[PDB]
Amino acid sequence: NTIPIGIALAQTSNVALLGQEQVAGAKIAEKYFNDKGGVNGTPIKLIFQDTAGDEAGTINAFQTLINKDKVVGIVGPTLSQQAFSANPIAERAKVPVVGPSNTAKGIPEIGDYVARVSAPVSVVAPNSVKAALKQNPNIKKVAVFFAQNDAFSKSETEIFQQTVKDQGLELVTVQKFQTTDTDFQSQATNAINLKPDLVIISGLAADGGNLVRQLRELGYQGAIIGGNGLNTSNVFAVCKALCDGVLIAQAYSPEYTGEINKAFRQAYVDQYKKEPPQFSAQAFAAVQVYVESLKALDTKNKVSKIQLPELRTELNKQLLTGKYNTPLGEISFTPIGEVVQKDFYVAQIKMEKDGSQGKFTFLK
């Protein structure tokens, strides 16, 4: 006997450029927690249902997890775009959802069953603008790009634009693209003609990486910030050496000294031979929230005796009250499911000259 927890992530489509990291983190969590006896001796079992890259696929994954797999709760989906359409399904069904990477404004407000462990754009994004200004205090002109078809990108760009204004900088253009575009010649040239000192990009990974590469190809030599959708080494293949120098804010640091981060990091580095990415750590944290909440609930109200609808409701209630020492730091939730998290960072892509390898260097 095991306790089923649903994992609804993008395992296919270009959204899997983020989702793959999340699967890795979730699997590390499953082993870590089951090696500690699961839920008071009862193992958990992660049940994966691929969402693919769109809303319909996420709705289908959630419905399968809820109805066929009988899960006690869901971790997912990968994108805020997907969450706004699919999470109401879980809300109506009274099944908890913990978002691992949904950073748009409004996610926890979807309902009483929606929480997230992924710090939102309003708290994460401004630090990369501040870091850019530290590296070049003479930045004056800023060009902004965003994916107009993606809910997260639209929310993120609003924060970047406000931060640019508040820092006293000139917003010389806001250019739109689609996440499915591969070619950005016209937008990139339009921006370059305005002589920006800083370019900010809110998109996802394939699109963001292609845009970075093309800006550099077209002769842009200024600073670049990528938003959370570019926050993966999977961009390295796309922009190669031309990824070098991109600044990306972080809600996780491999060097954070919490004991569980040491354990998580060691497991990750031993397997994948590089430092754990943010998305992997956040996925681990989401699983952790469920395990520790299930343990607390089970101690007060043995879960093997609770029928599934009540188990789901009681699990949701419990998780919102918990305090968790996770790889992200000490986190908790507000009464509506927003994450409470104190520490943020900025990292910078450092590519080897040949362009075949790189890493994220954390700024001090």
Ligand SMILES: [Mg+2]
């Ligand atoms: Mg909520």
